[PDB]
Design an enzyme around this catalytic site. Structure first.
Site, PDB file in Angstrom:
ATOM      1  N   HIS A  61       8.919 -16.958  73.011  1.00 27.12           N
ATOM      2  CA  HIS A  61       9.243 -16.853  74.430  1.00 27.12           C
ATOM      3  C   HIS A  61      10.171 -17.980  74.882  1.00 27.12           C
ATOM      4  CE1 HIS A  61       5.785 -14.163  74.549  1.00 27.12           C
ATOM      5  NE2 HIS A  61       5.004 -15.153  74.152  1.00 27.12           N
ATOM      6  N   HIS A  91       9.426 -27.458  77.761  1.00 32.24           N
ATOM      7  CA  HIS A  91      10.205 -26.310  77.323  1.00 32.24           C
ATOM      8  C   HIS A  91      11.234 -26.014  78.411  1.00 32.24           C
ATOM      9  CE1 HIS A  91       7.067 -24.670  79.907  1.00 32.24           C
ATOM     10  NE2 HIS A  91       8.027 -23.849  80.306  1.00 32.24           N
ATOM     11  N   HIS A  93      13.771 -22.680  80.322  1.00 34.74           N
ATOM     12  CA  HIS A  93      14.132 -21.289  80.583  1.00 34.74           C
ATOM     13  C   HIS A  93      15.637 -21.263  80.789  1.00 34.74           C
ATOM     14  CE1 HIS A  93       9.846 -20.399  81.429  1.00 34.74           C
ATOM     15  NE2 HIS A  93       9.860 -21.654  81.824  1.00 34.74           N
ATOM     16  N   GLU A 103      14.322 -20.609  87.023  1.00 34.42           N
ATOM     17  CA  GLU A 103      13.194 -19.880  87.605  1.00 34.42           C
ATOM     18  C   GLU A 103      13.134 -20.159  89.103  1.00 34.42           C
ATOM     19  OE1 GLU A 103       9.779 -20.482  84.912  1.00 34.42           O
ATOM     20  OE2 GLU A 103      10.398 -18.482  84.219  1.00 34.42           O
ATOM     21  N   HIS A 116      10.876 -27.616  82.126  1.00 34.81           N
ATOM     22  CA  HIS A 116       9.504 -27.777  82.591  1.00 34.81           C
ATOM     23  C   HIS A 116       8.771 -28.771  81.700  1.00 34.81           C
ATOM     24  CE1 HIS A 116       9.596 -23.577  84.592  1.00 34.81           C
ATOM     25  NE2 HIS A 116      10.187 -24.529  85.308  1.00 34.81           N
ATOM     26  N   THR A 195       4.463 -19.893  85.129  1.00 39.20           N
ATOM     27  CA  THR A 195       5.447 -18.828  85.298  1.00 39.20           C
ATOM     28  C   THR A 195       5.472 -17.848  84.128  1.00 39.20           C
ATOM     29  OG1 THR A 195       7.326 -19.929  84.296  1.00 39.20           O
ATOM     30  CG2 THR A 195       6.927 -20.373  86.656  1.00 39.20           C
TER      31      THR A 195
HETATM   32  N1  0VV Z   1       6.697 -21.964  82.581  1.00 38.95           N
HETATM   33  S1  0VV Z   1       5.262 -22.643  82.858  1.00 38.95           S
HETATM   34  O1  0VV Z   1       4.927 -22.565  84.232  1.00 38.95           O
HETATM   35  O2  0VV Z   1       5.305 -23.971  82.294  1.00 38.95           O
HETATM   36  N2  0VV Z   1       4.214 -21.733  82.044  1.00 38.95           N
HETATM   37  C1  0VV Z   1       3.380 -22.095  81.070  1.00 38.95           C
HETATM   38  N3  0VV Z   1       3.292 -23.416  80.641  1.00 38.95           N
HETATM   39  C2  0VV Z   1       2.375 -23.856  79.604  1.00 38.95           C
HETATM   40  C3  0VV Z   1       1.485 -22.749  79.084  1.00 38.95           C
HETATM   41  C4  0VV Z   1       0.497 -23.023  78.147  1.00 38.95           C
HETATM   42  C5  0VV Z   1      -0.309 -22.013  77.653  1.00 38.95           C
HETATM   43  C6  0VV Z   1      -0.134 -20.717  78.082  1.00 38.95           C
HETATM   44  C7  0VV Z   1       0.842 -20.415  79.012  1.00 38.95           C
HETATM   45  C8  0VV Z   1       1.648 -21.434  79.527  1.00 38.95           C
HETATM   46  N4  0VV Z   1       2.581 -21.151  80.514  1.00 38.95           N
HETATM   47 ZN    ZN Z   2       8.276 -22.924  82.081  1.00 35.44          ZN
END
Ligand code: 0VV
Ligand code: ZN
Length: 257
Positions: A61, A91, A93, A103, A116, A195
């Site tokens: 992803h 990470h 996007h 985002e 992020h 997200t």
């Molecule tokens: N884009 S985000 O808001 O960081 N989403 C995330 N971050 C970290 C994470 C860890 C485990 C499972 C899902 C997610 N989803």
């Molecule tokens: Zn993110």
């Protein structure tokens, strides 16, 4: 399973993750004229000097740079936060084109990408317990625009060829995340969610106003990653962003006047 395509993307997520239609989903559009300066926000504190990066992983992803979070090494404090939040991973996007990829949006403007930095509240002991709490997580979001290269990003770019496909990882020790920050720590903040599925509503979002600049060549290398696993048909890892969600009963606060 969930992804970013027409048949498994953001419009489908609510079927397995009904919170996708919840009351504090992320990202959101940041309407800069409606956001209100909050003089009560305490100073924000990004303490990354002892950060211990471990590994970089293509999870199908995005790619995650993971950190040792077994002690208070790299932490976020202050601002809207009570207590101490430990860095666990970062990470990005990004888009297929420079005109999309972020985002969050700012007065409906999309940036080319968004970083992020994910942190969990140490009062809850472990990330898994933190994501059962309304104040379990803090995510520092940083916009990327295309211009001059970001030197602190180049070590990330250069390892991507070794994690091209889903499930591949590489050693990524001794990476300094201070090199990913802009000069200013001015920010907007609001309560929201992860997200990506499971879309959990645990996050205090802290979105920096100042973007970092990265070069076209740097972002082009992000776009050579693959969503698929090795030996499967190639699907370029691009447009791995969720669009803005309804603000509902929330107010975005600004740290700056
Ligand atoms: N884009 S985000 O808001 O960081 N989403 C995330 N971050 C970290 C994470 C860890 C485990 C499972 C899902 C997610 N989803
Ligand atoms: Zn993110």
């Amino acid at each position: 399973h969930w992804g970013y395509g027409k048949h498994n993307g953001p419009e489908h997520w609510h079927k397995d993750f009904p919170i996708a239609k919840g009351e504090r989903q992320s990202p959101v559009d940041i309407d800069t004229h409606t956001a209100k300066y909050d003089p009560s926000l305490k100073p924000l504190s990004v303490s990354y000097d002892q950060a211990t990066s471990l590994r970089i992983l293509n999870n199908g992803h995005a790619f995650n740079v993971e950190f040792d979070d077994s002690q208070d090494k790299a932490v976020l404090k202050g601002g809207p936060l009570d207590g101490t939040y430990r860095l666990i991973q970062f990470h990005f996007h990004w888009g297929s084109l420079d005109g999309q990829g972020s985002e969050h949006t700012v007065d409906k403007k999309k940036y080319a990408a968004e970083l992020h930095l994910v942190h969990w509240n140490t009062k809850y002991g472990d990330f898994g317990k933190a994501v059962q709490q309304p104040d379990g997580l803090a995510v520092l979001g940083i916009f990327l625009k295309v211009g001059s290269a970001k030197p602190g990003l180049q070590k990330v770019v250069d390892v991507l060829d070794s994690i091209k496909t889903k499930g591949k990882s590489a050693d990524f020790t001794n990476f300094d995340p201070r090199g990913l920050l802009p000069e200013s720590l001015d920010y907007w903040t609001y309560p929201g969610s992860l997200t990506t599925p499971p879309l959990l509503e645990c996050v205090t979002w802290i979105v920096l106003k100042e973007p970092i600049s990265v070069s076209s060549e740097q972002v082009l290398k992000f776009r050579k990653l693959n969503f698929n696993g090795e030996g499967e048909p190639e699907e370029l890892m691009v447009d791995n962003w969720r669009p803005a969600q309804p603000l509902k009963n929330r107010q975005i606060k600004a740290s700056f006047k």
